[PDB]
């Protein structure tokens, strides 16, 4: 009552910040709807991605009501409407987005491990997420039935009934659980994909160590003047080559044993081992120069091409680098983590008259600032689909 909140910086900074996000958001999701809704829903990912684009658009359409109500220093019918309807829509569509981001992450993680009634399952799941958030949101709209007694007081908590304040606390608790379960899912999925990347790296580095062994021992043969040194190097080269021939590099992981990719990889080593074997036979006969000339045959255009090819097959592919799961984890840390940290103390100040005026106002400014970061997601989310061959 006696407490005053300074809205002079709020009425210039936030409507200006949200106006930018409204136009940036309309053009981003407009050029996402007209593209993604043309393509068919043949996978769960695209079903989840289509739900994400419309939940983004619903929360962007919420911004004009906010911009113009926050532009006014005092309360009014529009501020009451924001409190009761449009800002409630913002929150329930925000947790719809977080739910589908958690689902997209599970989907994308399961695709990395991978060597219709599931579309139905994804569709029913999509309906259940929307209906559930709507179920929680509806009493918040209905229990914001009180009129503002002081025209200078714009806080939604003063427009609420006793059970309205109770439900507000319950809803904000459930949403904290929805956030942290989805954040945990994203953290786990990211850690498992990152472990797989590090595992793919060591298998490539082990394989490349074999090539270094073979090429280092070839240098020894060139600078040698005796059959004992040539035989030693040739033996280590044969062992490195036969070791490398037994490997299943990340590019050959999901390939059939009788597939041409698997066959060319093994045959490439048979040609190089064969050349080492011919040079080793000569080294055993004490013919140093002849064994050096035959080992030097690995430097021919043909055998250098065979090496370059086999080494290329051993490299870590794009599949192992998941930019979609990294973007989602980046989005949770930037857009959602600060708001969810700022929320509980702010909810506590709204449901009980326990904090000092300046303490309350500080909690408001922090939640208002972090809520804006949360709104970037609606303008960021289409970039999970924007970086692929379909959009060039
Ligand atoms: C599932 S729907 C949902 N989820 C939340 N986490 C919510 N947190 C707040 N709301 C509602 O959205 C409206 C605005 O609440 P706040 O943003 O807490 O109010 P102000 O800081 O005073 O602008 C109120 O009717 C709240 O009950 C929420 N609604
Ligand atoms: C008042 C509130 C609860 C209204 C919610 C509207 C709901 C019913 C809407 C919003 C987003 C929609 C989804 C958008 C995209 C797809 C993918 C498509 O392959 C099948 C339908 C499906 C799965 C839609 C079904 C209906 C849907 C879940
Ligand atoms: C960090 C940059 C973000 C700055 C966000 C400023 C938030 C704000 O406006 O709160 C100040 C309040 O108005 C004071 O009376
Ligand atoms: C989405 C539809 C839900 C709309 C819910 C709106 C229900 C509002 C009912 C109400 O509490 O009326 C308040 C009155 O208009 C002011 O004092
Ligand atoms: C970066 C995100 C955190 C942004 C939150 C920090 C901005 C809040 C500004 C603030 O709290 O200043 C008000 C002043 O203390 C009067 O109570």
Closest residue by CA, ligand 1 atom 8: 172
* Ligand 1 contacts CB of residue 88 (under 6 A): yes
* Ligand 5 contacts CB of residue 337 (under 6 A): no
| CA–CA dist 36, 34 (Å, integer) | 6
Closest residue by CA, ligand 4 atom 14: 145
Closest residue by CA, ligand 1 atom 19: 156
216-235 burial: b if 16+ Cβ within 10 Å, else e: ebbebbeebeebebbbbbbe
Q: How far is the CA of 16 from the centre of ligand 3 (A)?
A: 13
* Ligand 5 contacts CB of residue 41 (under 6 A): no
* Ligand 4 contacts CB of residue 145 (under 6 A): yes
Closest residue by CA, ligand 5 atom 12: 362
Non-local CB neighbours of 344 within 8 Å, separated by 6+ positions? 172, 176
Q: Which of 316, 322, 387, 311 has its CA nearest to residue 110?
A: 322
Non-local CB neighbours of 110 within 8 Å, separated by 6+ positions? none
Task: Please name the residue that has the structure tokens 């003063």.
Answer: 158
Q: How far is the CA of 87 from the centre of ligand 2 (A)?
A: 21
* Alpha helix segments (H runs only) across 40-161: 44-60, 63-71, 77-81, 87-113, 117-142
Non-local CB neighbours of 319 within 8 Å, separated by 6+ positions? 112, 250
* Ligand 3 contacts CB of residue 6 (under 6 A): yes
Closest residue by CA, ligand 5 atom 15: 362
Burial class from Cβ neighbours inside 10 Å (0-12, 13-18, 19+) for residue 122 reads: buried
Closest residue by CA, ligand 5 atom 14: 362
Handedness of CA 369, 374, 376, 378 (dihedral sign): negative
Structure tokens at 146: 């009180």
Q: Gaps in the chain (C–N > 2.5 Å) come after which residues?
A: 115
**Ligand 1 atom closest to residue 141's alpha carbon, by position in its atom list:** 25
| CA–CA dist 243, 240 (Å, integer) | 5
């Amino acid at each position: 009552s006696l407490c005053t909140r300074d809205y002079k910086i709020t009425q210039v900074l936030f409507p200006l910040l949200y106006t930018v996000l409204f136009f940036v958001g309309l053009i981003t999701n407009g050029l996402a709807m007209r593209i993604f809704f043309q393509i068919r829903s043949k996978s769960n990912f695209i079903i989840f991605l289509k739900n994400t684009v419309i939940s983004d658009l619903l929360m962007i359409l919420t911004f004009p009501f906010k911009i113009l109500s926050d532009a006014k220093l005092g309360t009014g019918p529009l501020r009451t409407f924001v409190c009761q309807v449009t800002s409630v829509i913002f929150y329930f569509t925000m947790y719809i987005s977080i739910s589908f981001l958690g689902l997209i992450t599970i989907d994308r993680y399961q695709k990395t491990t991978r060597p219709p009634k599931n579309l139905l399952g994804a569709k029913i799941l999509s309906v259940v997420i929307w209906a559930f958030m709507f179920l929680l949101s509806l009493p918040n709209m209905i229990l914001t039935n009180r009129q503002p007694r002081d025209k200078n007081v714009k806080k939604c908590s003063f427009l609420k009934s006793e059970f309205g304040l109770v439900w507000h606390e319950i809803v904000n608790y459930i949403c904290q659980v929805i956030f942290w379960i989805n954040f945990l899912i994203v953290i786990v999925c990211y850690t498992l994909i990152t472990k797989e990347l590090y595992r793919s790296y060591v298998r490539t580095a082990d394989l490349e160590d074999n090539w270094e062994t073979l090429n280092d021992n070839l240098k020894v043969i060139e600078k040698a003047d005796n059959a004992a040194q040539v035989k030693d190097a040739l033996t280590k080269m044969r062992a490195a080559a036969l070791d490398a021939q037994k490997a299943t590099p990340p590019k050959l992981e999901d390939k059939s044993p009788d597939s041409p990719e698997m066959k060319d990889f093994r045959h490439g080593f048979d040609i190089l081992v064969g050349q080492i074997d011919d040079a080793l036979k000569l080294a055993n006969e004490g013919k140093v120069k002849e064994a050096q000339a035959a080992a030097e045959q690995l430097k021919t255009t043909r055998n250098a091409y065979i090496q370059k090819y086999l080494r290329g097959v051993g490299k870590v592919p794009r599949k192992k680098v998941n930019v979609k799961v990294f973007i989602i984890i980046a989005v949770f840390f930037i857009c959602f983590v600060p708001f969810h940290f700022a929320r509980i103390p702010y909810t506590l100040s709204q449901t009980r008259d326990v904090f000092d005026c300046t303490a309350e106002n500080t909690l408001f400014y922090v939640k208002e600032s972090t809520l804006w970061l949360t709104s970037l997601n609606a303008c960021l989310n289409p970039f999970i689909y924007f970086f692929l061959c379909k959009s060039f």
